Structures are given as C-alpha cells and as structure tokens.
C-alpha cells in the first residue's frame, strides 16, 4: 500500500513564541496559523525549549509555566511535537530576529572565567554556547556542564509527563552547539564572517588548548602547537598556509589536531546523548541530534569549512559517518540541515556541493542502519525547493509494491511566518505536503505508515574510539533519481 511511501511534515514554530520574560505572548494569533496548519494535513511542529528562558533565575530555578500553556495549545490543534533542548543562544545567527542569551547567572561566571566561552586564535570569546573543554568541570557552582544540561532534561521530563504519556511529544532534539548543532562556531556572523569565508577554528580557550598540549605530549611531539597559519573568517583556502596544496593539514601534526579537533564533537555528543537516553527512558519518544550542512568548498580537496567547523571529511576521509555510528548505539536520529539546496543556486566561487553532500551524508546514516530526518536551510517558498526537497526524502521514487528501499524518516520545514500562509505561497507548500504523503490524505496513526514509537531503551554499550573512526572509510553513496517522480510540478 501506498501509505508505507508516506513521509512525514513537521513546522517549525516562530522564533520567541515564549519571551525572554517567558510569557506565551499570543495564544490566540498562534492558534489560527496551527489551525490553518492542521487543514493543510502537517503532522506536527517543532520548537525551541530554551535553556536561557527557564533556568534564568538561577542554578535549578525552573519555572515550565509559559510552556505548557504552548504544550496545551499545540495538543489541543491536534498536531504532535518535536521539541529541541536549545542549550543555546538565539540572535547571532542567520534569520535569528529574536535575542535570547543562556542563562544570565552562567553568564556572570563567564565574567570571572571567560574561557567557558568558545575562543578564537585572537582571544574573542563566543557567548551563544559553552566550550566542549567545560564539559566535565565542576566551576558552575558545584556543577558541571554536562550535570546542568542532564538536570534541565530531567526536569523537562517530570515537569512534561502528562503531555509525554498523552503521546503529545514525539521527538527530543538535544541541543549540542551554535544554532544547536554538533559544531563549533566557526562562522559567526557577529564576528564579522561571511559567506562563504572558510571560518577558524574555535580551540583557544584554555581548557582545549591544555588538553590539546598534554595530548601532542602523549604522542611523542610536545613542541606541537594549536595552528597558526589557518587564516580568518572570511579567508580562502589557498590564500592560507594550512589550507594549501601540500599544507598544514596534511602533515602529521595538522592530521593529529584535525582528529584531536574533530574527536572532541563526537565524544561531547556522546556523553549528553547518554544523559539524554537517561532522563527519557521508558518514554515513547525517540532522541535526535542535528548536524550543519556546510556545503561552501566541498568540492576542493581541503574541506576547509568542514573542517574548521569540527567535521573532518575530506574526499578520502569521511567525517560523516562515524556521527552515524555513535547515534547508533543510542538509536538516535541524524538530522540535516540543509535538503533543499541545488548545486546551481550557489555562486560558483564558492565552490559548493549541496547536492553531493546530502547524498553522502544520508546515505552514510543508512548504511549505518540509522534513522535519518531533515530540514531546509533558508526560507523557500517555490516548487523547485519543495521538489529538491521530495527527492531526497525518497533518492529512488515510491514502490508500489511495499516500503521505498530508501526513505527520509521525517522533514522538518522551516518556518513558520505570515508569508508561508500568504494564499500563493500556502497553495504550492499544501501540494509539498501531499506529495511527501505520496498522494495520500493525512494519516493520524503513525503506525500505519511503519512509525511507531516504543518506550525508549537504554543506550547499547560505549562504543571505543577506534571502531568509530573505523567507519572513516570512504564508501559509494546510494543511487540517486535525477528528479522525483512525486512533483510539486511549479
Ligand atoms: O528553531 C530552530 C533553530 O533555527 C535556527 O537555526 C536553524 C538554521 O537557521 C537552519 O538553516 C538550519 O537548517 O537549522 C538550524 C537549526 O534548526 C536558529 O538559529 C536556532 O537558534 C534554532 O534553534
Ligand atoms: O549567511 C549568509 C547567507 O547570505 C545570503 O545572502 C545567501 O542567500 C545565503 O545562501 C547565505 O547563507
Ligand atoms: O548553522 C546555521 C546554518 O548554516 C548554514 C548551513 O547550511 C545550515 O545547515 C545551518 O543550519
């Protein structure tokens, strides 16, 4: 039957649906544009559970107020959830209008302590997320990194449980960085970079750099130091020593601090994967993870954006699926970033592969045997977008005899705005929801269309370092249809 073709929409809500001052300012404004949401045939939204709004007052001083009464809303417009355990700051990235800072009480320990900050090789400190090197450090008022997030989650948790028994809540997305992704921030904006400048890398604070010493130290080489002909933000790569031909990078010491560098992320992610998998067991719910699709110089040796920004993928090298392999073991979902784009959108100077990105990167997750979802990177309102869209959440078309050998587990769109509900543009986005429903009419009981959730188990055992980076070997992606044979048409 057709229905096991079906891949569901999820939206995302504005940004600031709950304040700064956490108060849900418009109930009654939101409901009609749910509402109008809910006709289309959308299956659920998405949201942004911000660290910065709920834990403001003080260490362990949660008020989850404002969201239930959006918790309540939502459920009560018949649409399920998805909800983001945003760890992180919201206005210095690209399409945020909004300005919500992390919490203000970590922020007065940043002043006495500014390397709880993301650094750069010039001493600027990043405000929008917490180092990896704090992670493990007990200098949040007896707490650690880590133990703040697990506690946050914990409380979600207990604090939600009528609305995760009710089924309301389907999906946790925990945040891991920038925008709340696994990378580091080396393209802000709010430093100056732009696109597509190759970024820096962000390993200066005194936490990283120490760990980074005693680590060359280890290995034999001691003198090693943290790169220094890497560039700036808006550099190109052959314009810098360790991004050329024959550069840095391909030396032993740039190839051990690009591992070092990139082994960083996956074991940061580990360890609050773990306290994720904790704090939700037995709840039907599933865990996710969201990874950036840095497009901009895929398709020169150096991978220089990829690079600076914690993912070591080179052509043969893959950065991607070791992600994969460690979202394994905690059954974890892989969400990109970044579905939409065609390779002949983006100036050729940039020297982007969009396209041959997402294709290694879903098919590195399938082959690991993981779940994999999505979203579009920037707002896009025309058929070729939705078309882009639809065939890569189906690479080989429908089956009319059973389940696409190849399929998406879910796509969410971002965003929600008046210009989305504006009548032309809500006309083609209803044809995009009904062609990722495979022509079929809404369908309220995910388990007809094979997506059932059963109660979270714990997370398999740790899984050493070594077989992660064993899945570095490069592999071919999965074929892919020139076009989809479900178009939006235009
Ligand atoms: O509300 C979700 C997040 O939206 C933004 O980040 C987006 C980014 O704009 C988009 O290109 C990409 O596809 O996804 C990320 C994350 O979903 C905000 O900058 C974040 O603060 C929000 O969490
Ligand atoms: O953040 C920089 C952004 O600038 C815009 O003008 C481009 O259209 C985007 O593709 C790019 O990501
Ligand atoms: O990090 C913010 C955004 O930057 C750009 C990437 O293409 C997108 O995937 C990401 O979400």
């Given at each position: 039957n057709m229905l096991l073709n079906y891949v569901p929409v999820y939206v995302m809500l504005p940004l600031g649906v709950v304040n700064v001052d956490n108060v849900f300012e418009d109930p009654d404004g939101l409901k009609e544009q749910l509402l109008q949401l809910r006709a289309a045939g959308v299956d659920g939204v998405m949201v942004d559970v911000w660290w910065g709004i709920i834990?403001?007052?003080?260490?362990?001083?949660?008020?989850?107020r404002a969201y239930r009464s959006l918790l309540q809303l939502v459920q009560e417009c018949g649409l399920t959830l998805q909800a983001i355990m945003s760890f992180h700051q919201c206005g210095g990235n690209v399409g945020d209008i909004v300005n919500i800072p992390i919490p203000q009480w970590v922020l007065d320990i940043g002043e006495s302590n500014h390397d709880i900050f993301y650094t750069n090789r010039s001493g600027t400190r990043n405000k929008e997320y917490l180092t990896v090197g704090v992670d493990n450090e007990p200098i949040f008022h007896g707490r650690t990194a880590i133990e703040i997030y697990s506690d946050y989650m914990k409380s979600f948790r207990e604090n939600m449980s009528d609305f995760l028994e009710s089924g309301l809540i389907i999906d946790i997305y925990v945040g891991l960085g920038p925008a709340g992704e696994l990378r580091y921030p080396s393209y802000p904006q709010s430093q100056g970079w732009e696109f597509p400048g190759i970024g820096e890398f962000q390993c200066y604070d005194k936490y990283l750099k120490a760990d980074f010493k005693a680590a060359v130290a280890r290995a034999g080489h001691p003198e090693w130091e943290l790169?220094?002909?890497?560039?700036?933000?808006?550099?190109?790569?052959?314009?810098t020593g360790f991004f050329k031909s024959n550069g840095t990078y391909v030396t032993e010491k740039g190839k051990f601090f690009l591992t070092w560098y990139s082994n960083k992320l996956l074991n940061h992610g580990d360890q609050i994967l773990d306290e994720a998998n904790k704090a939700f067991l037995g709840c039907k719910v599933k865990l996710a993870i969201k990874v950036s699709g840095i497009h901009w110089w895929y398709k020169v040796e150096n991978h220089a954006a990829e690079l600076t920004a914690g993912?070591?993928?080179?052509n043969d090298r893959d950065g991607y699926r070791p992600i994969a392999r460690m979202l394994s073991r905690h059954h974890a979902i892989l969400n990109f970033t970044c579905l939409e784009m065609r390779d002949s959108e983006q100036p050729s100077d940039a020297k982007s592969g969009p396209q041959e990105l997402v294709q290694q990167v879903l098919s590195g997750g399938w082959r690991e045997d993981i779940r994999v979802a999505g979203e579009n990177a920037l707002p896009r309102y025309d058929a070729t977008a939705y078309n882009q869209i639809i065939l890569n959440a189906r690479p080989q078309g429908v089956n009319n005899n059973g389940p696409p050998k190849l399929s998406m587990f879910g796509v969410t769109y971002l965003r929600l705005s008046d210009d989305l509900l504006q009548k032309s543009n809500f006309n083609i986005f209803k044809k995009f929801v009904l062609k990722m429903h495979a022509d079929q009419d809404y369908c309220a009981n995910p388990q007809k269309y094979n997506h059932a959730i059963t109660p979270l188990k714990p997370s398999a055992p740790k899984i050493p370092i070594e077989v992660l980076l064993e899945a570095t070997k490069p592999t071919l992606p999965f074929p892919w249809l020139p076009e989809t044979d479900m178009k939006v048409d235009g």
């Open positions: 834990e403001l007052k003080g260490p362990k001083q949660y008020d989850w790169p220094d002909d890497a560039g700036k933000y808006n550099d190109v790569p052959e314009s993912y070591y993928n080179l």
